[PDB]
């Protein structure tokens, strides 16, 4: 999920 | 010399955050992937929507073109990759075998191979024709954020939250080099220079670095942007002046001079984190895309 922050 | 990129089009139609945009090698097309489980194809020069491609069961984090511009590959949270015929929109193959979200993907120049990196801390090399997995590299000890082939496909570069960049021999799967640097900040993106001599790496401490692959030496550093939370695509722009192009968490597109490291432009207009930028193969054209509060793609044109 690149759209969610780490 | 400084560029003068200006907004030409905004492209709307994804219903969630956009995750990646890429120009087709023939310059005709822009492909975008998004959290809404869709790929969309748009005309590169007029911004006209062309089609939607669907079939993934969860969101898509990356998309990539074959060399002949006829195939796409997508990496998805449903733990698979999919190979698509662009003209028909049909799924040709489903690549299964990762045990977690697939995050990034790319064809090799010959386009007989696909490389993927996943949250299962692994890199996989797949055969395009059969869809079978040829190799599984135990590449990293944390999620893999980027994978990229070099000019001729003999090398793979991978990056991870473990703070490492690794250079692999494609044919043998053996690790040829590991780039480590200081306090091991998570590496969010990596890609070869067009000539294949240098490697551009983003770290989640608001930093981009240009490394010489042969020497293992950092040559340039680029700062001024915000990059702490997301894996943002960065690019070499080579059609006019030699720039470094990146997204940013302050909703701006940043453009630096490669040699001098000075910021030469900031593109304003996105209303969320700019997660992805892409540079047109022959024209001075930038495609940028943003997250949930924006959900659009913007095309920018410059004279240099």
Largest interface, C-beta within 8 A: A-B, 5 and 22 residues
Quaternary state of this entry equals heterodimer
Percent range of helical residues of chain B:
under 10%
Class derived from helix and strand content of chain A:
little secondary structure
* Helix amount of chain A: under 10%
Instruction: Output the structural class of chain B.
Output: mainly beta
Number of helices of chain B: 0
Characterize the main sheet of chain A. none
Give a count of the beta strands of chain A, DSSP E runs of length 2 or more.
0
C-alpha geometry of chain B: globular
Using only C-alpha atoms, the radius of gyration of chain A works out to: 4 Å
Distance between the termini of chain A: 9 Å
Summarize the entry for a quick read.
The complex is a heterodimer of chains A (6) and B (304). Chain A has 6 residues and is low in regular secondary structure.
Can you characterise this structure?
Helix content of chain A is 0%, strand content 0%. Chain A is elongated, with a radius of gyration of 4 Å. Chain B is an all-beta fold and 304 residues long. Chain B contains no helices and 28 strands. Chain B has strands at 6-11, 18-23, 29-34, 39-43, 49-53, 60-65, 71-76, 81-85, 91-95, 102-107, 113-118, 122-127, 133-137, 144-149, 155-160, 165-169, 175-179, 187-192, 198-203, 207-212, 217-222, 234-237, 243-246, 253-257, 263-267, 274-279, 285-290, 297-301. The chains are: A little secondary structure (6), B mainly beta (304). At the A-B interface, loops of A face strand 2 of B. It is classed as nuclear protein. The entry lists the keywords WDR5, embow, WIN motif, chromatin, nuclear protein. It forms a dimeric assembly. Structure of WDR5 in complex with mutated EMBOW T3V. Chain A is embow.
